[PDB]
Structure 1
Amino acid sequence: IGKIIKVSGPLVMAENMSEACIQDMCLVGDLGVIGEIIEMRQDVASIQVYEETSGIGPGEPVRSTGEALSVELGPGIISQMFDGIQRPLDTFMEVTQSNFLGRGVQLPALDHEKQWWFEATIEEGTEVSAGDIIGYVDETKIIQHKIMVPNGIKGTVQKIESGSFTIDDPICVIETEQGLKELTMMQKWPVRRGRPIKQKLNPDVPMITGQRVIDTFFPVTKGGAAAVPGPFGAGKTVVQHQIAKWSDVDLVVYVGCGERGNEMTDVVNEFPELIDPNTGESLMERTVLIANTSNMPVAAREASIYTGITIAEYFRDMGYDVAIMADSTSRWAEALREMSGRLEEMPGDEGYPAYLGSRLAEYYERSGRVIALGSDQREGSITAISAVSPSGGDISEPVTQNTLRVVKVFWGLDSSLAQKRHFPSINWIQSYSLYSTEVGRYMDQILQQDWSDMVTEGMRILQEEEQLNEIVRLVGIDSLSDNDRLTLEVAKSIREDYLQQNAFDDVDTFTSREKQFNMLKVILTFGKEARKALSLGAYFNEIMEGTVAVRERISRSKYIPEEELAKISSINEEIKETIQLIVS
């Protein structure tokens, strides 16, 4: 314990603190408010406290946790909400007996007292290696928790047993070089440090969020990183909800701080309301949620993403696909800028730390498809989606730019499209995806039809519209050639049907991979059919008239049930037949 030598504002230095390592959490004063130490004398340590240091003086006792800020991993961690430092909020209210957060109060991240049934799959005397799974526990119905061997420990397990124990009690005892080792269910690992993997793989597997524009226009591969704009009214929350509920991943992590009390409260209340269609259970049960207000400790807000990512890593190391969605990343960087000013470091660009890009790398680099540790060599992949909201109005914000470089996927939310009530409100022209070419091979093989030709052709029509839109302002649409006139109409169909998607209707909001193909084909079929019919014979007007019935069905074709998949693909017959009918 170290006595407080001097205490001014948020800085605190205490004597006899030599034993405490750097970056270790500490309890300062009688209150013992949570603080962080970046420096040592020694022995006096320059601790840093987020909690208010009012009512603290020289002579106060200080306790050191003896470890850097880390996440408590173990049974019961899921389905609950924690702060950026991972202290639970729901558990807090019960213990405090007060809504308001209390200074100098420490709560266990995971409930030790709660007992989760253990089933040990591994046999006795079996060799243990790092990343091995001794047994499985189930804290949630939707997701089966798995227990991996703690890092740095290797030996032969003399006894294995499956019984009901609290996470604190050692379920089994594994021999080690030093001696007999007993490992608890609960696992602790530093939030800032990346988790150990056996190898890192290039993610060539496209992820399906059930959204047409996302899966076709800008598909995200497994463990891919995507950045989305934060203008309000863009329906980003709706888009984020649709990703999470329609995600292929078994886990959906939500992190970032600090949303405004009225802005953040909505998440804590709305997010639980979400129900995973497949499981038929609350979406909360599948994954942990981290919620911090802007009042929260700066480190809690600044280390929220590092805390959130680490939770995803553990479940990723179990070989399960995870997805961490952080909002807002700019808020996080804003907490980092603040920390920079407090540390008195040299200012970089826009008051951000010069090593801001290095910080983004670590968090974003940990996400991806990688082989997990263990003899099994199972693999898990964390697909992280980050939303930036600089509020500067400039696209050249250091956070956005440094994020855009490392991420290979750019999503663009436009308020203009949102005002047109165009759901999802994503700008195809302002969004780019480098993965789209890689996704092509996987699609073509799986689809048994060339998906790349369709997607690349789809952009040309959309891109052509932008070029044609400038012409419309200059000269009337009728003046333009019938060929040019067709592109406008063909482009509209993709927008009206393939672009416009209602997130409320189950059949509309979620589209199967096979259905996305058929929907695009019937629109693309029209192009080649109308163009051939347009070049010779029938006029542009003639081709448009009498095509209302067929085009209207194409318009409402997205509403067709997934089971009746062949019914929606029947348009090609009519379109082909209609073209023949025009010629007299």
Structure 2
Amino acid sequence: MQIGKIIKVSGPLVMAENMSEASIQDMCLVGDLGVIGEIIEMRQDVASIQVYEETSGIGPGEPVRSTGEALSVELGPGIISQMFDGIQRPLDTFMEVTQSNFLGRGVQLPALDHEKQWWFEATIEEGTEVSAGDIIGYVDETKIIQHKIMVPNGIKGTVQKIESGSFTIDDPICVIETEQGLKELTMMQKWPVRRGRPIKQKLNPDVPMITGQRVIDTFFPVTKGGAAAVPGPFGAGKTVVQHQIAKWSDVDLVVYVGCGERGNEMTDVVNEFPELIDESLMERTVLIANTSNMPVAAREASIYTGITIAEYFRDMGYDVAIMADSTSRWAEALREMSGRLEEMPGDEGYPAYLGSRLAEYYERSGRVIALGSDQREGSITAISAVSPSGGDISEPVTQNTLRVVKVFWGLDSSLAQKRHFPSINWIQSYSLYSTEVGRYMDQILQQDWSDMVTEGMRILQEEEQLNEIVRLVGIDSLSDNDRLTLEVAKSIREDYLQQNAFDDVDTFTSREKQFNMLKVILTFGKEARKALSLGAYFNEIMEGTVAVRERISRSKYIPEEELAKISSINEEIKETIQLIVS
């Protein structure tokens, strides 16, 4: 009922007097055009508002209406398979309602389709005591994802009336006897993006995600419910890494949040994903797009709407991977507002609470027991891109992220230039899940995987040690043992580490295939090592193993249907080298 009056407009920052009735963090309609804003500060009756839309053409004296509610998302059927903007406005519907290929302003649009008919299957009996998280039933949203209707947080009581049928997301499908009195439920619940959805219990993520990317799964694996960062300079391949995981990982659901990035990248995903399989890929995918030239403040909104959508599906008992690409733009949006508010910056200009903001986001990710008597397990795996200026990772966003994640995939511009992809620095990168994952892999493959991987890294680390001294005098004077070492390291780098996303076969590797390739590589180093100790010469061994070493090199190209063509290289290694000694 109270109407504010704009007193100041400056970029995405607007100030309105006569706001005493409103609350911090309330959404607002701003100006004559009613653009979507948020109150972030109140000094007496004056609200500082950050606008999620463009402010050109707005000025002092125009009205402000506070909606009395915090930035929320609509959660219900019709959510999967859609591209939303940062404040959850559906982009396909926007185009048709506004009749434009371009993005307009002040136009209110419901997140989901409220006219659509879904078939709701009730799976609960009348007169069951329920509370938050209990699944009263489900809608088949896609052929693969079953959308479970859960009692919203806050509601405790006894199912009075329920039945199956065709309904919109507005129709009441259940009535509950509560202490406050009868409440009716629809298939949709609203959640504030800045609150973490509650859970029964947080768990330790112990199951490794399959990315199918050899370097990640072997040396720096992420588990389901874990958090990883990919900091890298421009053009290093952060985006492509995230596309690969969206495409190939064995999560149930993928939420891809394009935060301050390229428009084309998003149109690539909507267009390419329906043509892929894992059953279409788009059918397990949600897209929030707030591109680089869309409103700055909407970058924050997008990160938050994505994780909240992810949590919603987590509660249903699903495994969810969330890609934020990139979190630097979100931080940089915070840097823009901070500067406009004339706050005292932390390092590099970012607000001092930068770290705490990041920690809130990541702490929302993870493997959990969701609320409800069922005690379902669900995971959220966070994969974040970081875009440090000049590729320098002493910067705050990378540094603060490294303190709250457990996986670091540091990309190297020097590896990208020689087209070594993914351009992960095997020396610099790490995974805290490495030890637990080794165990899980040993059990599954029924081989000593842990040991292979340790020797792999041990060799890579020796290569590094050597190359330091080498780049100033080496090679000519190197011992045969060490010459061999450089060759095994070279085989790892080229034959195993290097993998091209765009090759039909090399785009994905199964564990059965990864294990076989690495065995073949280490078997070479082992058998060659034993030959040197019997009196053979490096040069003898290399000249005598040209054909077999070509096979090892091309095993990345062997089809999954033909793994014997790889594991059979192991016999050829042993025979060939056994022969050379005599």
**TM-score, scaled to structure 2:** 0.94
Residues 128-162 of structure 1, C-alpha deviations (whole Å, 9 max, x = no match): 12111111112223322222111100111111111
**Residue 4 of structure 2: SS of its match in structure 1?**
coil
**C-alpha displacement at 1:109, in angstroms?**
1.0
Residues 250-309 of structure 1, C-alpha deviations (whole Å, 9 max, x = no match): 211111421245666555655666554xxxx44332121011123333331122211111
Seen in structure 2, the aligned counterparts of structure 1 residues 564 and 261 have a Cα distance that, compared at 3 Å, is closer
The answer (yes or no) to whether the contact 1:218–1:436 under 8 Å persists in 2 is yes
Residues 38-93 of structure 1, C-alpha deviations (whole Å, 9 max, x = no match): 34466664444343445556664433222111111111011111111111222111
The answer (yes or no) to whether the contact 1:272–1:283 under 8 Å persists in 2 is yes
The answer (yes or no) to whether the contact 1:124–1:159 under 8 Å persists in 2 is yes
| Cα distance in structure 2, aligned partners of 1:74 and 1:60 | 35
Residues 303-359 of structure 1, C-alpha deviations (whole Å, 9 max, x = no match): 221111111111111111111111111111000111212333222111111100000
Seen in structure 2, the aligned counterparts of structure 1 residues 41 and 178 have a Cα distance that, compared at 3 Å, is farther
Seen in structure 2, the aligned counterparts of structure 1 residues 95 and 500 have a Cα distance that, compared at 3 Å, is same
Seen in structure 2, the aligned counterparts of structure 1 residues 414 and 270 have a Cα distance that, compared at 3 Å, is farther
Q: Which moved more, 1:144-153 or 1:570-579?
A: 570-579
The answer (yes or no) to whether the contact 1:444–1:451 under 8 Å persists in 2 is yes
The answer (yes or no) to whether the contact 2:270–2:282 under 8 Å persists in 1 is no
Seen in structure 2, the aligned counterparts of structure 1 residues 93 and 486 have a Cα distance that, compared at 3 Å, is same
The answer (yes or no) to whether the contact 2:259–2:289 under 8 Å persists in 1 is yes
The answer (yes or no) to whether the contact 2:318–2:377 under 8 Å persists in 1 is yes
Unaligned segments of structure 1, at least 5 residues: none
**Residue 38 of structure 2: SS of its match in structure 1?**
strand
Residues 440-476 of structure 1, C-alpha deviations (whole Å, 9 max, x = no match): 2212222222211110100111111112223333335
**Residue 145 of structure 2: SS of its match in structure 1?**
coil
| Cα distance in structure 2, aligned partners of 1:505 and 1:102 | 40
The answer (yes or no) to whether the contact 2:138–2:149 under 8 Å persists in 1 is yes
**Residue 36 of structure 2: SS of its match in structure 1?**
strand
Residues 351-398 of structure 1, C-alpha deviations (whole Å, 9 max, x = no match): 111100000001011111111111111111111111111224422110
Q: Which moved more, 1:471-480 or 1:368-377?
A: 471-480
Q: Which moved more, 1:295-304 or 1:305-314?
A: 295-304
| Cα distance in structure 1, aligned partners of 2:556 and 2:295 | 47
The answer (yes or no) to whether the contact 1:219–1:436 under 8 Å persists in 2 is yes
**C-alpha displacement at 1:578, in angstroms?**
2.5
Seen in structure 2, the aligned counterparts of structure 1 residues 170 and 549 have a Cα distance that, compared at 3 Å, is same
Seen in structure 2, the aligned counterparts of structure 1 residues 297 and 476 have a Cα distance that, compared at 3 Å, is closer
The answer (yes or no) to whether the contact 1:256–1:331 under 8 Å persists in 2 is no
| Cα distance in structure 2, aligned partners of 1:501 and 1:539 | 32
Seen in structure 2, the aligned counterparts of structure 1 residues 524 and 9 have a Cα distance that, compared at 3 Å, is closer
**Residue 176 of structure 2: SS of its match in structure 1?**
strand
The answer (yes or no) to whether the contact 2:90–2:111 under 8 Å persists in 1 is yes
**Residue 275 of structure 1: SS of its match in structure 2?**
coil
| Cα distance in structure 1, aligned partners of 2:57 and 2:564 | 72
**C-alpha displacement at 1:555, in angstroms?**
1.9
The answer (yes or no) to whether the contact 2:234–2:387 under 8 Å persists in 1 is no
**C-alpha displacement at 1:406, in angstroms?**
0.8
Q: Which residue of 2 aligns with 1:387?
A: 385
| Cα distance in structure 2, aligned partners of 1:156 and 1:576 | 71
Q: Which moved more, 1:486-495 or 1:25-34?
A: 25-34
Seen in structure 2, the aligned counterparts of structure 1 residues 62 and 250 have a Cα distance that, compared at 3 Å, is same
Seen in structure 2, the aligned counterparts of structure 1 residues 583 and 377 have a Cα distance that, compared at 3 Å, is same
Seen in structure 2, the aligned counterparts of structure 1 residues 495 and 360 have a Cα distance that, compared at 3 Å, is same
Seen in structure 2, the aligned counterparts of structure 1 residues 478 and 76 have a Cα distance that, compared at 3 Å, is same
**Residue 185 of structure 1: SS of its match in structure 2?**
coil
**Residue 391 of structure 2: SS of its match in structure 1?**
coil
Seen in structure 2, the aligned counterparts of structure 1 residues 475 and 7 have a Cα distance that, compared at 3 Å, is closer
Q: Which moved more, 1:140-149 or 1:170-179?
A: 140-149
Stretches of 4+ moved more than 6 A in 1? 5-9
Q: Which moved more, 1:498-507 or 1:359-368?
A: 498-507
The answer (yes or no) to whether the contact 2:335–2:351 under 8 Å persists in 1 is yes
The answer (yes or no) to whether the contact 1:117–1:164 under 8 Å persists in 2 is yes
| Cα distance in structure 1, aligned partners of 2:7 and 2:433 | 56
The answer (yes or no) to whether the contact 2:50–2:297 under 8 Å persists in 1 is no
Seen in structure 2, the aligned counterparts of structure 1 residues 376 and 533 have a Cα distance that, compared at 3 Å, is same
**C-alpha displacement at 1:502, in angstroms?**
2.6
Seen in structure 2, the aligned counterparts of structure 1 residues 55 and 229 have a Cα distance that, compared at 3 Å, is closer
User: Does residue 126 in structure 1 map to residue 124 in structure 2?
Assistant: no
Seen in structure 2, the aligned counterparts of structure 1 residues 293 and 8 have a Cα distance that, compared at 3 Å, is closer
Q: Which residue of 2 aligns with 1:531?
A: 529
**Residue 270 of structure 1: SS of its match in structure 2?**
helix
| Cα distance in structure 2, aligned partners of 1:47 and 1:457 | 56
Seen in structure 2, the aligned counterparts of structure 1 residues 555 and 6 have a Cα distance that, compared at 3 Å, is closer
Seen in structure 2, the aligned counterparts of structure 1 residues 125 and 40 have a Cα distance that, compared at 3 Å, is same
Q: Which moved more, 1:217-226 or 1:567-576?
A: 567-576
Seen in structure 2, the aligned counterparts of structure 1 residues 265 and 339 have a Cα distance that, compared at 3 Å, is farther
| Cα distance in structure 2, aligned partners of 1:2 and 1:148 | 38
**C-alpha displacement at 1:15, in angstroms?**
5.9
| Cα distance in structure 1, aligned partners of 2:232 and 2:90 | 27
**Residue 124 of structure 2: SS of its match in structure 1?**
coil
The answer (yes or no) to whether the contact 1:122–1:134 under 8 Å persists in 2 is yes
**C-alpha displacement at 1:422, in angstroms?**
1.9
| Cα distance in structure 2, aligned partners of 1:285 and 1:189 | 23
The answer (yes or no) to whether the contact 2:122–2:163 under 8 Å persists in 1 is yes
| Cα distance in structure 2, aligned partners of 1:376 and 1:31 | 47
**Residue 362 of structure 1: SS of its match in structure 2?**
helix
Q: Which residue of 2 aligns with 1:371?
A: 369
The answer (yes or no) to whether the contact 1:320–1:379 under 8 Å persists in 2 is yes
| Cα distance in structure 2, aligned partners of 1:539 and 1:574 | 19
Seen in structure 2, the aligned counterparts of structure 1 residues 130 and 296 have a Cα distance that, compared at 3 Å, is same
**C-alpha displacement at 1:209, in angstroms?**
0.2
| Cα distance in structure 2, aligned partners of 1:268 and 1:137 | 23
**C-alpha displacement at 1:239, in angstroms?**
2.1
Seen in structure 2, the aligned counterparts of structure 1 residues 244 and 52 have a Cα distance that, compared at 3 Å, is closer
The answer (yes or no) to whether the contact 1:130–1:153 under 8 Å persists in 2 is yes
**C-alpha displacement at 1:241, in angstroms?**
1.7
The answer (yes or no) to whether the contact 2:87–2:302 under 8 Å persists in 1 is yes
Give aligned pairs, total: 580
| Cα distance in structure 1, aligned partners of 2:243 and 2:51 | 35
Seen in structure 2, the aligned counterparts of structure 1 residues 421 and 40 have a Cα distance that, compared at 3 Å, is closer
**TM-score, scaled to structure 1:** 0.93
The answer (yes or no) to whether the contact 2:239–2:385 under 8 Å persists in 1 is no
